[PDB]
Amino acid sequence: LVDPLTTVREQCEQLEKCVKARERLELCDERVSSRSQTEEDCTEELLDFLHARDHCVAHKLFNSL
Amino acid sequence: GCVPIANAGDFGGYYCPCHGSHYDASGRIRKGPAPLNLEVPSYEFTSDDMVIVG
Amino acid sequence: TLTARLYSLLFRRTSTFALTIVVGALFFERAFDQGADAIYEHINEGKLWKHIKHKY
Amino acid sequence: TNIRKSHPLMKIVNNAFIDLPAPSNISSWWNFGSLLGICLILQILTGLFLAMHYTSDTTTAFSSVTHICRDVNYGWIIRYMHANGASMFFICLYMHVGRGLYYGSYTFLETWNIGVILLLTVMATAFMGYVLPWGQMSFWGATVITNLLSAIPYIGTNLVEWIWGGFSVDKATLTRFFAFHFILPFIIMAIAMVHLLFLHETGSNNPTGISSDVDKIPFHPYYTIKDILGALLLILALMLLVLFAPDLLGDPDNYTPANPLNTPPHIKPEWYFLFAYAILRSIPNKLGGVLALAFSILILALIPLLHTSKQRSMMFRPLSQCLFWALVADLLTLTWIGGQPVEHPYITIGQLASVLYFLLILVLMPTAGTIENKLLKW
Amino acid sequence: RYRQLARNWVPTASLWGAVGAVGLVWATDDWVPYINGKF
Amino acid sequence: WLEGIRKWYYNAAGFNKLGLMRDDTIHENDDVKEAIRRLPENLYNDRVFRIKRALDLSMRQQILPKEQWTKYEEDKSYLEPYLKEVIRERKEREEWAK
Amino acid sequence: RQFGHLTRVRHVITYSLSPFEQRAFPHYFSKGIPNVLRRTRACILRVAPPFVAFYLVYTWGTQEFEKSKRKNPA
Amino acid sequence: SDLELHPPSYPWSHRGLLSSLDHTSIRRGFQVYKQVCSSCHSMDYVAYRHLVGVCYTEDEAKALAEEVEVQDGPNEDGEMFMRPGKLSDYFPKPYPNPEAARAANNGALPPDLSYIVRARHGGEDYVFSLLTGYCEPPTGVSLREGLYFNPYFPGQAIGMAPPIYNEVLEFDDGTPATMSQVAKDVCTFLRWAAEPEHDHRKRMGLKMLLMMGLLLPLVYAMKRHKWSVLKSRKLAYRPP
Numbered sequence A: 001l002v003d004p005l006t007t008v009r010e011q012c013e014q015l016e017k018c019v020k021a022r023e024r025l026e027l028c029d030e031r032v033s034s035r036s037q038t039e040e041d042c043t044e045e046l047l048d049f050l051h052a053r054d055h056c057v058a059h060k061l062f063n064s065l
Numbered sequence B: 001g002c003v004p005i006a007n008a009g010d011f012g013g014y015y016c017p018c019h020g021s022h023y024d025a026s027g028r029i030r031k032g033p034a035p036l037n038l039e040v041p042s043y044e045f046t047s048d049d050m051v052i053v054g
Numbered sequence C: 001t002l003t004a005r006l007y008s009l010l011f012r013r014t015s016t017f018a019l020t021i022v023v024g025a026l027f028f029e030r031a032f033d034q035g036a037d038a039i040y041e042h043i044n045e046g047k048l049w050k051h052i053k054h055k056y
Numbered sequence D: 001t002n003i004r005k006s007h008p009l010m011k012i013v014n015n016a017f018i019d020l021p022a023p024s025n026i027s028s029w030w031n032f033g034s035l036l037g038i039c040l041i042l043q044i045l046t047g048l049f050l051a052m053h054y055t056s057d058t059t060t061a062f063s064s065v066t067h068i069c070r071d072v073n074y075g076w077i078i079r080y081m082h083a084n085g086a087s088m089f090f091i092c093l094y095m096h097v098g099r100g101l102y103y104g105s106y107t108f109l110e111t112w113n114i115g116v117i118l119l120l121t122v123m124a125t126a127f128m129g130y131v132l133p134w135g136q137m138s139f140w141g142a143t144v145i146t147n148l149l150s151a152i153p154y155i156g157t158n159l160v161e162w163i164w165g166g167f168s169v170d171k172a173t174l175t176r177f178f179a180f181h182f183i184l185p186f187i188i189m190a191i192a193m194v195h196l197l198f199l200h201e202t203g204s205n206n207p208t209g210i211s212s213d214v215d216k217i218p219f220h221p222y223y224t225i226k227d228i229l230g231a232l233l234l235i236l237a238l239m240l241l242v243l244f245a246p247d248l249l250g251d252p253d254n255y256t257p258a259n260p261l262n263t264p265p266h267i268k269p270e271w272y273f274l275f276a277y278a279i280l281r282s283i284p285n286k287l288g289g290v291l292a293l294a295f296s297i298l299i300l301a302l303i304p305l306l307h308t309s310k311q312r313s314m315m316f317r318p319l320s321q322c323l324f325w326a327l328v329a330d331l332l333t334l335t336w337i338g339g340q341p342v343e344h345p346y347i348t349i350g351q352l353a354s355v356l357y358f359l360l361i362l363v364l365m366p367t368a369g370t371i372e373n374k375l376l377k378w
Numbered sequence E: 001r002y003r004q005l006a007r008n009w010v011p012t013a014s015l016w017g018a019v020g021a022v023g024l025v026w027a028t029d030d031w032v033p034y035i036n037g038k039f
Numbered sequence F: 001w002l003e004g005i006r007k008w009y010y011n012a013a014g015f016n017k018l019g020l021m022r023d024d025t026i027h028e029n030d031d032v033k034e035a036i037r038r039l040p041e042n043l044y045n046d047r048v049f050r051i052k053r054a055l056d057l058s059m060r061q062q063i064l065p066k067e068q069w070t071k072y073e074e075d076k077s078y079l080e081p082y083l084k085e086v087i088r089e090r091k092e093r094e095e096w097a098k
Numbered sequence G: 001r002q003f004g005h006l007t008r009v010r011h012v013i014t015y016s017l018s019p020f021e022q023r024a025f026p027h028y029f030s031k032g033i034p035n036v037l038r039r040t041r042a043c044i045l046r047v048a049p050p051f052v053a054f055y056l057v058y059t060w061g062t063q064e065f066e067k068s069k070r071k072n073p074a
Numbered sequence H: 001s002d003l004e005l006h007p008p009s010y011p012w013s014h015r016g017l018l019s020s021l022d023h024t025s026i027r028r029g030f031q032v033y034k035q036v037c038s039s040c041h042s043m044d045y046v047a048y049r050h051l052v053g054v055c056y057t058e059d060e061a062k063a064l065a066e067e068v069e070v071q072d073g074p075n076e077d078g079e080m081f082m083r084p085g086k087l088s089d090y091f092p093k094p095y096p097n098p099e100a101a102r103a104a105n106n107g108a109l110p111p112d113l114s115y116i117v118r119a120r121h122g123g124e125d126y127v128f129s130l131l132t133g134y135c136e137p138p139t140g141v142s143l144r145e146g147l148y149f150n151p152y153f154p155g156q157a158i159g160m161a162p163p164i165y166n167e168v169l170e171f172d173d174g175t176p177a178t179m180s181q182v183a184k185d186v187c188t189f190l191r192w193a194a195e196p197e198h199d200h201r202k203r204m205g206l207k208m209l210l211m212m213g214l215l216l217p218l219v220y221a222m223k224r225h226k227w228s229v230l231k232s233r234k235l236a237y238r239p240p
């Protein structure tokens, strides 16, 4: 059994706007990952990523429920 | 407003689990959101081994 | 005109104008309730208990 | 001869509301007085019904209200009405005060100061009513605000503890606030009687600001129909909220029972006090903030003396009109600020808005009156 | 001239100020002997 | 010049659009009441009318045709002489009572 | 004071018509739309400016709160 | 922490101005509370009776009531006993007090769910995106243990373990029990629980809009009629 949410999440990640926040997350993973002494997290970049995905999800998801 | 847990925290006094605040043994806020230090009431030490808070 | 017929029949005497209004409110209450109800329950087809209750 | 003119009781009602010479030309802005009366009756009725079902014990109170909303017949609509009702009352109040300022109605001094008192009295009422459900906002709101009277030197601490009837807002405070909240509307009715009594000595102002004795008209039927129309529009509005958006003007924390151990993330009073909250919050010092909060309201009482214009109404006063709308927008801003957490940039927006407010009333609009006078060769 | 040649409410408002002082002090309840001087 | 601004202001004010003159718009305190009370029949009835007119227009949310607007140049201070003297008189009684 | 001794008026003729002789809405749009435009042009430069400034101070300050809650590279 | 992710806006079947709750969805959502949430979370303001006419027949509701053990007031001896529930009983508290609830949840108290839709900004949108929003921390984030990462919560560290996933329960109607489907249904029930009146209110809204459509032009017409005497009048100044 496939949750239609995980389907639609994947479809939404296709979108241009999403890919741009995905890049932002990628750059931040490198950056925090590679240092051993500073205090950053990538919450910010993740959150605006989810924001773009989830506004997309909302439009479509409900159809198939 | 939560209840700090005693004998805990970066400052070995009080650590809030909630938004992560660190009070010293003096109760003074050291590391966390908590605007001001812990609330020091009005006490008197009735007997050598008795205290009254109020 | 229709309105003329109404004026002379119903509205001239004030006792009659009142009798009109109570009787008409009666039929209006029933009519308006029934119609608005049907409007709501068609706007909300399927979603009301009274639409699904046959199942239980 | 004629009963309406003779009979001791009917005479009054006739003189007050039927044969009263009204100006020909009062606008929709004169609707608000009647509407305020309606607001007041509305609250009393809905209030009375609620009070047949509510309890003012800390333990039972939150649930008694929700019981109204779940298990009392039509209790829900009544409750939401009394709550949106309170908003509609403050809208009517602020519109009404607006007209006072713009059209120079405040020249009617006795009428006006009674009115200031009406405002204060309705404020007290709504403050204490909001506590009655015993939600998170109710409780923490009532605590912060009453505590300001602690900043009164010498007596502050004692005074706040006597209001409370203990060491915090607790059982005794709620039971007394219920009592006060019940009797206050009654006193508002009498003050309002008096409010009218003084108005009836002068008759009404009008938008031109120019005396209208040469063109008065009997109140009934011109203004009977027109008030009714206005009341419909008030009802349209009230019920739009109650039936489509009952929670639009409230805070959700007020669905979470009052808890003396867990303080809400942002504490605010109801929207109709936000401008004054924001003025208070602008001042660093606590007694400073208190006196500013009090002055933001009591200043109403001074505006009569600050009038400079040779013309009564702002109709023909362009510079004054601009300043008036500035004040209005500023109060919208003060409200926005008061709903916001104390952070940049809002701290500084608020400070500015607070300055602007007092600046307008005490210095700018007096000046403008005078500049206008010179522009007219008087 | 004639107001200032009033100022005859100055000695009367002196006595009214003592009524206000002593009145607030009575309603509210040390250095007056007997009364409260002996709690 | 000063007069350039004053003329702009007059049109902005807009009482002229109702066929009022400046003196019609003065707020009536006791001094003004009395000045009106000393107005001769011509000048009094004229004022009565201008105001009836304006009030009736205010009701309708209407103005006059521009042709009919009170002209800046033609607006005489009908009231000032009556009023200047009412005030001179008052100031005198004040003086006296000190 | 009641109708009868409000004030003293001379030489003014008032002509009017029963409501039952007349339309409730004479030329409601054809006269009314133009009149409403006229009314609005008259006031908007007094009324609208403040609300523009509100919208701006609110736009700006809301987004200044946005920005300050983010991190910046340092 | 002190950041954002405010919920997006899902097109609920009851978002629309005149749109009622989907009662079938409420029925399923009750099930989701009953089988999943009710282990930790109270809902003190609902009784078995309240389900009647909403999502359950009267005896269906009675069945559901009989399934639970509730304490009853002192008998002859002056002792407390247990019994099967009736319609008249409120949905039972999972623990006898809040402190007990805390001990059982690593010191966190699960909020009662009666009003939860109503007492959180975003309501259904918030709660839906909460249940379906659980993700693995971003790079650099380490939460105290037994507190989970959820971008929709204040601070992003929530003391609730993800309660919802595919086939977490069985549906009376047999609707595909996918994670998103169960989060929808429970939300629908949570809206109804917070605001039983939702449908009645919306019906009245319609009737109020209709009556006002009639009454506003009507009274407005009455106004214009009376005032026509005055609106029409022409003035004439005629000195000798």
Ligand SMILES: CCCCCCCCCCCCCCCCCC(=O)OC[C@H](COP(=O)([O-])OCC(O)COP(=O)([O-])OC[C@@H](COC(=O)CCCCCCCCCCCCCCCCC)OC(=O)CCCCCCCCCCCCCCCCC)OC(=O)CCCCCCCCCCCCCCCCC
Binding pocket: D027, D028, D029, D233, D234, D236, D237, D240, F061, G036, G039, G040, G042, G043, G044, G047, G048, G051, G052, G055
């Ligand atoms: C850049 C992008 C971003 C944008 C932001 C930047 C902003 C830029 C634009 C600038 C905006 C600010 C400036 C204001 C507007 C410009 C000036 C202007 O208004 O010119 C009017 C101007 C005023 O005429 P005037 O002769 O100079 O003086 C008026 C007289 O004093 C008396 O007139 P009267 O005696 O002939 O009586 C009629 C009068 C009556 O006036 C009054 O009594 C005032 C108030 C009552 C309204 C009218 C009665 C209807 C009842 C309304 C409520 C019922 C329920 C409906 C739902 C409410 C809506 C939320 O009606 C009006 O004048 C209508 C104006 C009402 C404006 C209300 C302001 C909206 C509040 C928003 C607050 C902000 C927060 C938002 C949050 C949302 C809510 C939770 O003249 C006309 O337009 C003609 C007037 C006749 C009306 C024409 C047709 C309109 C129909 C009226 C009924 C509906 C009104 C709408 C009410 C609510 C809407 C939300």
Ligand SMILES: CCCCC/C=C/C/C=C/CCCCCCCC(=O)O[C@H](COC(=O)CCCCCCCCCCCCCCC)COP(=O)(O)OCC[N+](C)(C)C
Binding pocket: C011, C012, C013, C014, C017, C018, C021, C022
């Ligand atoms: C029966 C038990 C009720 C107990 C409480 C007492 C209530 C009083 C009346 C109740 C029953 C309804 C009958 C109404 C009587 C008829 C009204 C009337 O007789 O007088 C009208 C006043 O109403 C108008 O304006 C009306 C327009 C404005 C809207 C106000 C209408 C009031 C609605 C009545 C409320 C009913 C209460 C129900 C409670 C369960 C007069 O209008 P017109 O000047 O154009 O007519 C001119 C006269 N011609 C036409 C005969 C020549």
Ligand SMILES: CCCCCCCC/C=C/CCCCCCCC(=O)O[C@H](COC(=O)CCCCCCCCCCC)COP(=O)(O)OCCN
Binding pocket: D113, D116, D117, D120, D121, D123, D124, D127, D145, D269, D273, D276, D277, D291, D293, D294, D295, D297, D298, D299, D301, D302
């Ligand atoms: C004119 C000079 C201006 C100078 C002012 C400078 C400040 C110094 C004055 C001190 C006296 C203060 C007494 C009046 C109360 C003012 C504060 C106030 O508005 O209080 C009301 C209750 O009304 C009440 O408490 C009042 C209810 C009835 C009492 C009648 C008061 C009579 C005064 C009227 C004058 C014409 C409550 O409102 P809040 O809940 O605090 O508002 C919430 C805002 N966050």
Ligand SMILES: CCCCCCCC/C=C/CCCCCCCC(=O)O[C@H](COC(=O)CCCCCCCCCCC)COP(=O)(O)OCCN
Binding pocket: D029, D094, D095, D097, D098, D099, D102, D207, D296, D297, D300, D314, D315, D316, D328, D331, D332, D335, F061, G043, G047
């Ligand atoms: C402690 C109390 C503090 C002080 C009180 C402040 C009061 C709060 C304000 C509420 C609004 C008050 C209304 C004032 C009177 C209205 C004057 C008016 O209508 O002016 C219009 C323009 O109208 C228009 O443009 C009408 C548009 C109406 C605008 C809506 C107001 C926004 C609400 C803000 C809420 C915080 C011009 O009318 P007139 O000069 O009479 O000329 C008519 C045509 N010849």
Ligand SMILES: CCCCCCCC/C=C/CCCCCCCC(=O)O[C@H](COC(=O)CCCCCCCCCCC)COP(=O)(O)OCCN
Binding pocket: C033, D042, D045, D046, D232, D235, D239, H203, H204, H207, H208, H209, H211, H212, H215
């Ligand atoms: C002394 C008598 C007082 C009576 C006041 C007269 C009101 C005059 C104005 C009326 C506005 C017209 C719009 C009203 C819509 C009414 C439509 C309707 O039937 O709605 C009611 C609820 O509405 C409602 O409940 C809406 C009613 C809105 C009235 C509120 C204003 C008065 C405040 C009352 C506070 C004490 C119930 O509908 P249902 O539950 O379907 O019942 C079916 C029919 N019985």
Ligand SMILES: CCCCCCCC/C=C\CCCCCCCC(=O)O[C@H](COC(=O)CCCCCCCCCCC)COP(=O)(O)OCCN
Binding pocket: D318, D319, D322, D323, D326, D329, D330, D352, D356, F012, G041, G042, G043, G044, G045, G046, G049, G050, G053, G054
């Ligand atoms: C420290 C922080 C500061 C931020 C404050 C934010 C809140 C308030 C902000 C701005 C309000 C500004 C209002 C200015 C507009 C006035 C000019 C104008 O547009 O209209 C003038 C009115 O004349 C006149 O009225 C003559 C011009 C005189 C206007 C005085 C301006 C003072 C406004 C207040 C500023 C706080 C001309 O229009 P009308 O005469 O109606 O005729 C139109 C056809 N010409």
Ligand code: HEC
Binding pocket: H032, H033, H036, H037, H038, H039, H040, H041, H105, H108, H109, H110, H111, H116, H120, H127, H130, H131, H153, H154, H157, H158, H159, H160, H161, H163, H164, H186
């Ligand atoms: C015990 C394992 C739980 C089960 C089963 C469910 N929930 Fe829960 N929940 C639990 C705790 C300890 C908390 C407090 C969280 C904290 O950070 O302190 C919660 C909280 C919620 C909330 C509140 C979200 C908020 O903004 O505060 C909601 C809306 C919530 N829980 C819903 C919920 C639903 C719908 C469940 C069944 C589908 C459910 N919970 C099960 C513990 C437990």
Ligand code: HEM
Binding pocket: D040, D043, D044, D045, D046, D047, D048, D050, D051, D054, D065, D079, D082, D083, D086, D089, D122, D125, D126, D129, D130, D131, D132, D133, D181, D182, D185
């Ligand atoms: C000016 C008049 C009044 C105003 C402004 C007013 C205002 C308020 C307000 C704001 C509340 C909180 C509403 C809420 O959010 O729940 C409230 C509650 C209440 N009021 Fe009033 N009220 C008034 C008159 C009355 C009267 C006369 C009574 C009773 C005689 C009354 C009884 C109640 C009761 C019982 C509650 C608690 C129930 C509830 O919260 O809705 N009110 N009032």
Ligand code: HEM
Binding pocket: D029, D030, D031, D032, D033, D034, D036, D037, D040, D093, D096, D097, D100, D103, D105, D106, D108, D111, D112, D114, D115, D116, D117, D118, D119, D122, D188, D192, D195, D196, D199, D203, D204, D205, D206, D300
């Ligand atoms: C419960 C609150 C109030 C009620 C019930 C009330 C009632 C009324 C009524 C019926 C009128 C006449 C109708 C009108 O002109 O609008 C009126 C006029 C007036 N009120 Fe109020 N009022 C209240 C509050 C206030 C307040 C707070 C003020 C001022 C701060 C005020 C000042 C005035 C003034 C100046 C007038 C005369 C307006 C004019 O004729 O131009 N009132 N009031």
Ligand SMILES: CCCCCCCCCCCCO[C@@H]1O[C@H](CO)[C@@H](O[C@H]2O[C@H](CO)[C@@H](O)[C@H](O)[C@H]2O)[C@H](O)[C@H]1O
Binding pocket: D284, D343, D344, D345, D347, D348
């Ligand atoms: C503009 C200069 C260039 C460098 C700074 C660039 C950032 C943008 C300008 C604002 C700088 C922030 O610095 C400052 O912080 C304080 C503290 O919250 C806030 O300012 C406030 O401080 C305290 C708040 O308790 C008040 O007493 C004070 O009256 C008020 O100005 C403002 O937010 C801002 O004036």
Ligand SMILES: CC1=NC2=C(COCC2)C(=O)[C@@H]1c1ccc(Oc2ccc(OC(F)(F)F)cc2)cc1
Binding pocket: D016, D017, D022, D023, D026, D030, D031, D033, D034, D035, D036, D037, D038, D040, D041, D189, D192, D196, D204, D223, D227
């Ligand atoms: C008198 C009066 N003069 C003027 C105007 C308009 O300007 C001219 C003067 C009015 O609009 C009015 C007015 C005021 C109230 C009202 O309806 C009531 C009555 C009583 C009531 O309960 C209360 F408790 F207050 F008594 C509630 C509403 C109708 C008309």
